[PDB]
Amino acid sequence: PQITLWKRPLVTIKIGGQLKEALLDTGADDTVLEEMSLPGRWKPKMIGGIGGFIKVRQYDQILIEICGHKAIGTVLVGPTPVNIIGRNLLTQIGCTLNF
Amino acid sequence: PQITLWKRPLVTIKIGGQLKEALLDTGADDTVLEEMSLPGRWKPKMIGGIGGFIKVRQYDQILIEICGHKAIGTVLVGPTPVNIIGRNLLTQIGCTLNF
Ligand SMILES: Cc1cccc(C)c1OCC(=O)N[C@@H](Cc1ccccc1)[C@@H](O)C[C@H](Cc1ccccc1)NC(=O)[C@H](C(C)C)N1CCCNC1=O
Ligand SMILES: [Cl-]
Ligand SMILES: [Cl-]
Ligand SMILES: [Cl-]
Ligand SMILES: [Cl-]
Numbered sequence: 001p002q003i004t005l006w007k008r009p010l011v012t013i014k015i016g017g018q019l020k021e022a023l024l025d026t027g028a029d030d031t032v033l034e035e036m037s038l039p040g041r042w043k044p045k046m047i048g049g050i051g052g053f054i055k056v057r058q059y060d061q062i063l064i065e066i067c068g069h070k071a072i073g074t075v076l077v078g079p080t081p082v083n084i085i086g087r088n089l090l091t092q093i094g095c096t097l098n099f
Numbered sequence: 100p101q102i103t104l105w106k107r108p109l110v111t112i113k114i115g116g117q118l119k120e121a122l123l124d125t126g127a128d129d130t131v132l133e134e135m136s137l138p139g140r141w142k143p144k145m146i147g148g149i150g151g152f153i154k155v156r157q158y159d160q161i162l163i164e165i166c167g168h169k170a171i172g173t174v175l176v177g178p179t180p181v182n183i184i185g186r187n188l189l190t191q192i193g194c195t196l197n198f
Contacts (some may be wrong), residue, residue, distance in 0.1 A: 003196040005186040009125050024196055025126025026108050027183060032149075047148020048180055050131075062134040069198065080149055084126060087104040090198075097102040097123055099168065 001068065002098075006084055013085065015075070016066040022066075026097055028086035032056055032062075032076040054079050058076060069093040100166065112173070112184065113164040119182055120163075125196060127185030130163075131175040137161055144175060152176050166191035 003009050009024040016038065032047060044058040056078030066072050066085055071092045102108045108123040129146065141156040143149050155177030162171050165184060170191035 001196075001198065005125060005189045005194060008128070008186070009196055022124075023126050025124070026104060027122050027124030027126045029107070047149065050146060050179065051148060051151030051153055054150055067198075072169070077126070087107070091104045093198050095104060095196055095198040097104070097108055097125070097194055098197050099100065099166070099192050 011067045011085070013067075013083070015062070022083035022085050024095070025084045025086055026067075026090065026095075028084045029088070030055065030074065030076055030085060031086040031089050032080045033083045034077075034080055034084060036077055038062060038075065038077060042077075047076065047078075049080075056080075064089065066093055106172065108165045110184075112166075112182070114161070121182035121184045123165075123189060123194065124183045126181050128187065129183075130172065130174050130185045131155060131177065131179045131183045131187050133176075133182055135176055136174060137174065141176075146175065149185055155179075163188060165192050171182055 013022045038059045043060050045058040046053045056076040058072050062075040071089050112121045121147050125182045137158045141158045145152050155175040161174040170188050172187045
């Protein structure tokens with residue numbers, strides 16, 4: 001697709017068999033979803049946003065589908081206000097900015 | 100240009116007679132810059148996201164140049180950790196996401 005930016009670039013993702021809404025975010029280095037269960041072990045990470053840093057759980061090698069495009073990569077889980085698809089998965093699905 | 104997302108999409112902007120580096124941020128509704136002076140009237144605003152809320156000054160009808168593309172819009176100024184070009188100005192330069 002080509003997605004314009006007059007509204008938030010929200011898309012449907014699928015993770016753990018569940019559909020969620022998430023923001024395609026070129027300003028985010030990594031992908032972070034609101035609290036949920038994922039398989040396997042997790043490692044600690046902090047990420048910084050507009051108001052400061054939060055602690056999240058880092059899960060690696062997770063299956064996630066973004067607008068129908070299958071990806072496998074790192075997904076953070078924590079106290080984010082919105083589900084965010086960051087550059088790590090945007091690059092996987094072939095996303096670029098164009099003007 | 101076509102900008103890939105292996106690295107942060109940082110570009111040079113020109114604003115208030117100054118050159119600065121800023122992030123092209125599809126996950127931002129608004130444009131927010133680190134402390135600087137801008138001309139004209141402003142009103143206070145709170146923005147919140149990851150890590151909570153900051154207070155900013157909202158300036159309207161501000162001229163900016165982003166990668167050689169001119170635009171006008173609202174610019175927020177305050178203690179953001181990074182200069183952010185949000186959708187309100189990304190639309191004006193015809194910036195889209197593509198995959
Ligand atoms: C930088 C980073 C590293 C690792 C992982 C992640 C997810 C990372 O990104 C975290 C992050 O908050 N990035 C922001 C820009 C960023 C990068 C680096 C440091 C600080 C910020 C931005 O892109 C997304 C984030 C999304 C959001 C969150 C809560 C509510 C609404 C939107 N958007 C916002 O905060 C914007 C701001 C910038 C005007 N925003 C907040 C007011 C309401 N609407 C809105 O759009
Ligand atoms: Cl749109
Ligand atoms: Cl990854
Ligand atoms: Cl605007
Ligand atoms: Cl358009």
